[PDB]
Amino acid sequence: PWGDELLNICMNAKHHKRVPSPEDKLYEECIPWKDNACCTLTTSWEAHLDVSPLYNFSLFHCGLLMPGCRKHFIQAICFYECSPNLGPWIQPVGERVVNVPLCQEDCEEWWEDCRMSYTCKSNWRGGWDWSQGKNRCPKGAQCLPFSHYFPTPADLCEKTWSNSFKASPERRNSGRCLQKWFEPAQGNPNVAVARLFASEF
């Protein structure tokens, strides 16, 4: 009826805590989730690594990203790894997450801050040259601005992480979309969203 089954839980993926609980200490961008996290300190740290061991997926493939752009991606990782408010979007493929609605501001700022940075592909979900252990751009793939390969914010949100996220037309504080980062001072705006979606309505 209200999906409490689906509230305050962690997905069964390889890095996740089996159940959420508070953390004394999380690294940088993952701190907003301290209160109650699906990530350990180690996980939160690993989210900030160049070629983070979590996915062995390189952000530098077209060269080092502008720091502003790197920040967005890392936050996305913290969110996926640490959020306890994802139940409604969990699916088995041992579980993943599908079409989590990221508020338009989240996708817009991300897109905006990565405009100057460079990539070679528009579907990062596959088709890379994988020979070094880490992905590199395949034969003939040109490095160009993000705004070329992801013409809209929506493209960026949805395609980088294989439809884990959905770019919502809904804006923030609507009750109906999640933030991939939030200021810890202001308290977690995703809890109510989670509750809403767990419900029949």
Partner: protein, 232 residues
Amino acid sequence: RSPWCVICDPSVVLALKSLEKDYLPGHLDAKHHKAMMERVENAVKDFQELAYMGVVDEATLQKGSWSLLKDLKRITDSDVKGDLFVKELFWMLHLQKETFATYVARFQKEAYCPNKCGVMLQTLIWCKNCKKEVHACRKSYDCGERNVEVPQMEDMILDCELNWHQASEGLTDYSFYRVWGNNTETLVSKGKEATLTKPMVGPEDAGSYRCELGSVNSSPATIINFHVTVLP
């Protein structure tokens, strides 16, 4: 497809504008100026010589720029004209780019993120857009334990300094904590001093200590743990 990082130096771009407006009139047929410059601008807008990350430190950039400027001035001071001038100039740009590639490859292998543990913030310049911003070099969460034995009644010095600290940006204070067996801590000093001195030590000063070098950011730049033995 990337610019030659050297145009991120204003003196370089101004030197090239001066070449166009001041040098070409007296040294090359007027009917060639336009095309010559288009060709130079293209030389600088693409740098094919280079696993290149597209970044450079101010030092490397400067070295490159100084070098290019020395050679360019060599040519303009020689007062050379016409086909000769054209050939020398483009040879020189070419040579310079190759030289610079060397400087970059060295920088990547020696000066980029030289920290071996912890987190160093270092300013870099992004070649594609000349934008100068600070990059976080993340090596390890830790910097690892120090085992330290101090003769009773000599002074205990705990050194938190690493080589790279002085060069890193966005660092704040060295914090030293005692780590008690009951899982609590006490902050014993917090300051710009990289070492902790505790004089004329007794058995009561043995045990665990931790250094945190603080960051303008949310997390510390260096964590070092010390285990102190007092030798009677």
